[PDB]
Symmetry: C3
Subunit: 177 residues, 3 copies
Amino acid sequence: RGDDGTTGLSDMSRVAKTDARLVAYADCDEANAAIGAALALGHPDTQITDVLRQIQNDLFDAGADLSTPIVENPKHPPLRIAQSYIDRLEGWCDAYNAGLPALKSFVLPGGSPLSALLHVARTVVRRAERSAWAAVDAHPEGVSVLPAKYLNRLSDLLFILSRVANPDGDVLWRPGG
Amino acid sequence: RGDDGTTGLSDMSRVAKTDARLVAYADCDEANAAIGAALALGHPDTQITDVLRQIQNDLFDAGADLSTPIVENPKHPPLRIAQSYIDRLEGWCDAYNAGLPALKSFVLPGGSPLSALLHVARTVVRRAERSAWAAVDAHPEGVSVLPAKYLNRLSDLLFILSRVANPDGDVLWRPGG
Amino acid sequence: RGDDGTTGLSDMSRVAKTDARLVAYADCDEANAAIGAALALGHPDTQITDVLRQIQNDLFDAGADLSTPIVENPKHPPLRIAQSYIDRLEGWCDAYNAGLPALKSFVLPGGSPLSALLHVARTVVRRAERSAWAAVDAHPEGVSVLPAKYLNRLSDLLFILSRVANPDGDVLWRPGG
Ligand code: B12
Ligand code: B12
Ligand code: B12
Ligand SMILES: C[C@H]1O[C@@H](n2cnc3c(N)ncnc32)[C@H](O)[C@@H]1O
Ligand SMILES: C[C@H]1O[C@@H](n2cnc3c(N)ncnc32)[C@H](O)[C@@H]1O
Ligand SMILES: C[C@H]1O[C@@H](n2cnc3c(N)ncnc32)[C@H](O)[C@@H]1O
């Protein structure tokens, strides 16, 4: 309970394959792959493609952050998620939500390949957010909360974009119906 | 270890982003999205579409149940999964399994887009079932077992439906082969 | 905390639906389904299809291993992953990596349906590997490490194969860019 089953963080330090930090950046990888599948199978417009590819780049920045313990006075300044990343996601949320009708209930996920795979990506990003909070909980001084805050806003954006993309419009949940 | 990293259940009460109840209803969302991708990329018949869309509606009923703590004498009667939901899944299992050949081993998942994505959905539903049992284990008096029992029968149905949809028939596992 | 929420290992012994061994073989199922979706939606060459179908067969061998407790002098010899399985994955890694250009950074996942879904499968296999290590950690004498070692090499192969399949070539991460 030995080197089998261990691996390294970005500073080379050794962690279990079940380490909370690693689980968080692994789930960012899984989210990034879900976004790649939305791009590859969904056929998005050029503008949505550019947004999603920036997000895929951002997710590696988030994994770099999560994989790099916070230390006092580091050798060289680490790559970290900054508030500016979240401000950018919010700007996109506002712009893409402007034309959507008001929604009063849950929507059944699906629609076009693109809208359905943006819902898949949304749910995987939300899973990554939970893992990112668990990493902060395990290392309150050594892990940034900004990766988790980024993933939180990203799932808002992916919901909005699934609605933009959906040719079925909003198919509403009917509670108990 | 602070309001960062917390959110709300349906009664507004505060929970960690890693709370077992939340993880259970989040995995129902992820399962619902997997079913949406099967619909969107798989091109199912009208009858299978109607069944799967009812299931997607049911999954929000299950998430409403899991997100709403059980209390004595509630203000108003909560939406909960009932045995009738599971009886309906079983009726569908029986009807769709009737024409299938007897199976004597595991089948390699895949086939058409629809059959392959019904296997993906099956595995995500089984993951949600595990999370739903973990929520009951964490709150034996406050969480219903019926969401987990529903998810259990749903994975049976999704297996059956993947076989119906599969144009490759049953491609059998060859142990050690 | 009762038979509700329990199930059986291959020797019939009773385990929780959250048992580490079960979670490991369940995640092998989820990985197997992700590979099936890559096959079904990605349109691979005959050679890649044959490799991936052998891997799908291997994943059931790995689940059989994980589901069967190790005992002294068993009734009959159990099916287990052997080093030969990993040697085969390594041979495939070497052959398929030979023509690829040297890579100096992370690649954004996506590309064709096939390359994008091989990245999805890669990330799910890595999740299964973590679960397989957690099963060993829970049962250091009763669970083999070879399923986890197999899943480790499999994620290397799925990375390599995603690069082979990708018509976009290598789209590189630009840190902070
Ligand atoms: C954390 C981590 C990850 C995380 C998070 C990464 C993130 N940023 O989101 C995740 C789980 C996503 C990951 C995935 C993989 N990783 Co990784 N990862 C690391 C790790 C520990 C730190 C990376 C980091 O973020 N550095 C911080 C950034 C700022 O550093 P940087 O200035 O960009 O410089 C990095 C890159 O140049 C990178 N790099 C250099 N050569 C190559 C070659 C390849 C193929 C890749 C992918 C990267 C890579 O390494 C530098 C130092 O980290 C390193 C080991 C380490 N101790 O540094 C391995 C490492 C980069 N990973 C590696 C590999 C192989 C992979 C995977 C191919 C594993 C797999 N089979 O799935 C994938 C690739 C995913 C992709 N889409 O490209 C190798 C790459 C070397 C090699 N064998 O080619 C490394 C060096 C570990 C090792 N030696 O075995 N990884
Ligand atoms: C549990 C929960 C979930 C769970 C489980 C839900 C289920 N039933 O399966 C999951 C994880 C699936 C979920 C997902 C989301 N949720 Co939610 N969720 C909740 C929560 C806590 C309870 C919902 C519930 O089940 N109520 C029980 C049922 C019976 O109530 P009801 O009579 O149907 O009335 C509900 C609906 O009318 C709903 N509603 C009203 N306006 C709108 C608008 C939108 C867009 C949505 C989705 C719902 C919604 O809110 C009422 C009260 O809950 C509420 C907050 C709360 N305290 O009530 C948030 C809430 C409904 N969720 C919200 C949001 C934003 C989302 C997501 C878009 C988040 C995301 N980015 O992924 C997704 C949408 C998924 C979808 N496909 O539509 C918001 C919606 C308000 C808004 N900002 O538009 C709420 C109100 C929380 C908040 N204020 O920030 N959620
Ligand atoms: C571990 C386990 C799994 C694991 C790992 C399996 C692996 N090898 O990777 C996972 C989670 C993948 C799994 C999935 C399922 N399983 Co399962 N599983 C088991 C279990 C506990 C052991 C299987 C094993 O690996 N045996 C070791 C190998 C070497 O044994 P073997 O010589 O091949 O003989 C096996 C097969 O012939 C198999 N078998 C015989 N008849 C049939 C019929 C079907 C449809 C299947 C799938 C298998 C099957 O059972 C024998 C003994 O295990 C058994 C129960 C048990 N106690 O044996 C159930 C069992 C095989 N599973 C069963 C079922 C139903 C399923 C699922 C359909 C559940 C679902 N709805 O998702 C899927 C099918 C996945 C697929 N793609 O085919 C049933 C099959 C009987 C039936 N009702 O038809 C069994 C017998 C349990 C039960 N009675 O309820 N399972
Ligand atoms: C919309 C509802 O979803 C829940 N919620 C908030 N964050 C997450 C997350 N990362 N993953 C799953 N569910 C979450 C909360 O209960 C919120 O009110
Ligand atoms: C078919 C086999 O799958 C296992 N099993 C039962 N329920 C689940 C679940 N939600 N998820 C994963 N595996 C499960 C049991 O071991 C069963 O016998
Ligand atoms: C490439 C990097 O990915 C991490 N790593 C190693 N194994 C896994 C795994 N199963 N899942 C997620 N990440 C892992 C290590 O940090 C390694 O250095």
